[PDB]
Symmetry: C3
């Protein structure tokens, strides 16, 4: 199987506006598939149709509507509560890589705290050490400079083994989404073996 | 007063399906009363009528409907927000024992974190050292193997003095509900003095 | 500019009933303005009209209705999600002082945990060290005596530099609201320079 599978977790940062650009780039990438997990807050910054528009844009398709979304569904907490398979378990099995872009201060704090009362955090909590995780913090600079940020980055890094694509240095802006994609393709390369 | 009073806290684990069997067993037990606190997630795995059906089953009653629930009401967060007495305070006073079965990873993390934005966690936070607590973790094995699980079990055990009926060793399955009940009856025995 | 600006954060403690008395006192105070941030739980203990009634009472105004609220709006989480300015950022810039009165055990735990999934906690997380913070814990005495309370007060104090107007010694009752106001006026004095 020559397919690399990425789960993109988007959280309640303004940088979630670039989530459709990332998905569009991953779709167009030949041997990479992408599934998206959106926290409730992140859904305020983009819609499913933004993603669909973004996929068509990247694939040089004319406008129109679907439907099956090419097929890249944006999963939310609601989907999980509707012997049957459990969604965050299915996503854990599927994923070869988990990318949190953007990662808000809240999600960072929740991850460091081990709290898992959403699809996104249940997925991360359920992961096996098989699956690598890339965290891209994205927040107001005064949120990033907060004392608890570095303590949570520490927990997330040393304890959990997550990789931090730390924000651009007013430090706090997310790593540019194009850089995110090429980081992802670098892992796809590793995986192809 | 020869009555032993148990508050059962059920959380969002699949093992919550066995919560009605526990309640049915505690009701039938001669000198034990039970009250139930359900987190919102746990209410997805069983209903009030499951409990009622389970009580009738244990008490050899024919089917029918109530009403007063024998009277074992499943308390939820909603009830608490409807000089008046505060529910989680009333439950703390009432309880001789608090049993968390099942305890999800989320609830474990919330307890260890001291977060109390629900009936269940407000009750635990408000307890006096008079009242013992039994925690029965129940989660996907990769959630239990997560690094933060053991750190939270440590906080819950050493700091809070909670007793952990640790999961069955794929470690993560809840202690069998029949074992839970007999653990409970062992405390009832202690209490009878 | 001879105006001192206070943001009052009210949380889900019964002491939130005195929040309108505080606002009324701050409004009447000549060189002090007040804005209010209410957690969802705190909105159960008082309404906007309680505040308005309380302002009229303090300003010797006859009853009637508004409208513009004099103008002291009680901000909630809902307002924040309705290039545009972000509310908790605007409030951070505005505030010369942040007062958490009352501070529940939950909010204390969330602050210590760095969790910021509400207007109140996003505001606190986004603050600059320029702005001082006064925390007034207010909870059931058994919640205050809980082991995690002192650990959170420690984090909040040493790590974050927040000032704790610790509860009255059954320790747990909030510092009397009149004492809160005069503490606030003491900071206004400092600020006037
Ligand atoms: C308009 C707006 C923009 C926000 N931008 C950010 C941000 O860039 N980074 C961040 O950490 N939080 C930001 N927040 C705060 C989070 O959205 C808020 O804490 C949210 O509840 C976190 O939810 P989450 O854990 O799903 O990300 C913003 C909030 C609003 C209302
Ligand atoms: C179908 C389904 C089954 C789940 N089973 C478990 C479980 O067995 N153990 C666990 O820790 N979490 C489990 N979860 C995740 C929790 O339900 C989720 O984290 C929830 O928000 C926790 O809420 P709580 O703190 O009230 O338990 C499950 C989720 C779903 C959707
Ligand atoms: C009637 C009632 C009164 C409460 N009083 C207090 C209190 O005085 N102090 C406290 O810490 N929690 C109290 N609680 C519990 C909190 O309201 C609950 O934990 C809430 O979810 C916390 O939300 P918050 O973080 O916005 O304050 C009370 C709850 C109820 C239902």
């Amino acid at each position: 199987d020559g397919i690399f599978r990425v789960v993109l977790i988007t959280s309640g940062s303004v940088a979630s506006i670039k989530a459709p650009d990332i998905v569009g780039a991953l779709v167009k990438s030949p041997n990479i598939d992408v599934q998206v997990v959106a926290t409730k807050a992140s859904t305020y910054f983009y819609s499913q149709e933004d993603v669909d528009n973004s996929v068509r844009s990247a694939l040089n398709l004319p406008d129109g509507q679907t439907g099956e979304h090419f097929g890249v569904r944006v999963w939310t907490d609601e989907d999980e509560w509707s012997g049957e398979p459990i969604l965050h378990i299915e996503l854990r099995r599927w994923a070869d890589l988990v990318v949190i872009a953007p990662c808000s201060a809240d999600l960072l704090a929740k991850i460091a705290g081990g709290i898992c009362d959403s699809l996104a955090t249940s997925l991360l909590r359920a992961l096996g050490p098989s699956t690598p995780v890339i965290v891209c913090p994205a927040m107001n600079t005064y949120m990033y400079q907060h004392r608890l940020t570095t303590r949570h980055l520490a927990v997330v890094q040393e304890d959990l083994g997550y990789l931090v694509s730390g924000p651009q240095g007013g430090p706090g802006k997310m790593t540019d989404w194009r850089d995110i994609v090429s980081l992802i393709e670098g892992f796809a390369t590793m995986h192809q073996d």
